[PDB]
Amino acid sequence: QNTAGCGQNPPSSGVKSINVGGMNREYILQLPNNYDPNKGHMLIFGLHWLSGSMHDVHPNYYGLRQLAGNNAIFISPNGINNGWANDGGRDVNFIDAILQQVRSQLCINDSQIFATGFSFGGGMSYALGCARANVFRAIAPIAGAQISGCSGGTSPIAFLGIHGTNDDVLPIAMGRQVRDRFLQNNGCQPKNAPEPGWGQGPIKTEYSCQPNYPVTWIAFSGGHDPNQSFVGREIWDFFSQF
Numbered sequence: 001q002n003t004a005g006c007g008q009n010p011p012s013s014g015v016k017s018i019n020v021g022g023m024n025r026e027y028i029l030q031l032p033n034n035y036d037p038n039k040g041h042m043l044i045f046g047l048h049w050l051s052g053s054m055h056d057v058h059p060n061y062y063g064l065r066q067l068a069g070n071n072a073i074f075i076s077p078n079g080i081n082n083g084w085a086n087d088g089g090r091d092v093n094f095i096d097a098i099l100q101q102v103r104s105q106l107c108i109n110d111s112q113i114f115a116t117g118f119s120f121g122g123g124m125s126y127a128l129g130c131a132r133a134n135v136f137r138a139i140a141p142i143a144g145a146q147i148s149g150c151s152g153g154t155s156p157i158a159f160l161g162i163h164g165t166n167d168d169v170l171p172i173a174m175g176r177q178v179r180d181r182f183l184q185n186n187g188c189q190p191k192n193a194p195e196p197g198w199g200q201g202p203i204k205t206e207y208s209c210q211p212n213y214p215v216t217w218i219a220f221s222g223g224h225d226p227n228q229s230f231v232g233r234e235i236w237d238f239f240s241q242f
């Protein structure tokens with residue numbers, strides 16, 4: 001169902017400021033080229049990595065911007081200390097604040113809200129899938145790990161995990177642990193997910209789960225780097241299936 005901001009005169013795209021429990025925080029809002037205020041848009045959060053900032057995820061949003069057409073509104077939130085430590089849920093609360101604001105301003109389809117990010121941003125996407133399975137339709141950690149916490153974490157939510165076999169910063173076992181939680185939550189039949197050899201193309205495993213909560217795992221042969229040609233395409237195809 002569509003939000004109250006449908007039919008409202010839109011704000012400008014750009015850097016936004018927001019008060020989260022007394023803390024001034026910032027995010028980039030990026031509206032589509034053609035913004036129809038009467039069409040319910042996808043809302044896609046892209047979450048940066050440690051030492052990076054919201055200015056690194058904008059303007060390409062992990063390859064999604066080039067493929068999303070006018071279907072999506074993009075958010076690039078800025079982490080405190082250039083990370084997503086999420087102490088006591090403060091970063092989940094930050095996302096709650098953005099959601100409350102943009103849902104009242106923009107035309108969003110509440111069944112099409114998504115989160116993706118690399119490394120620390122993958123941990124934060126995981127933390128949102130754990131605590132906000134009511135809000136998010138799917139998450140897609142890229143080289144993710146349990147580094148932003150996981151409060152709750154028993155509800156099903158559609159999940160796409162992408163990880164490199166040669167990642168020496170967050171080893172792929174850490175990403176499998178994230179994946180394995182939603183294999184359980186989403187009622188997926190156990191199944192071998194092979195992973196590519198050196199110099200071999202990525203291997204996508206699509207698990208058999210409850211058809212509303214699919215799980216997909218894509219292992220590639222590289223390292224701690226989200227800039228693989230397949231990333232934007234695969235995340236877009238996963239998010240746009242709903």
Ligand SMILES: *[C@@H]1O[C@H](CO)[C@@H](O[C@@H]2O[C@H](CO)[C@@H](O)[C@H](O)[C@H]2NC(C)=O)[C@H](O)[C@H]1NC(C)=O
Nearest residue numbers: 001002003039040041108109110111112241242
């Ligand atoms: C909001 O998104 C939902 C889910 O993507 C849309 O509902 C789907 O619409 C397609 C085609 O119209 C159907 O094949 C699906 O079965 C629907 N799914 C669900 C869960 O309803 C919906 O049309 C979008 N727009 C609004 C205004 O709700």
Ligand SMILES: [Mg+2]
Nearest residue numbers: 049050119120
């Ligand atoms: Mg990081």
Ligand SMILES: [Mg+2]
Nearest residue numbers: 068069070071
């Ligand atoms: Mg379009």
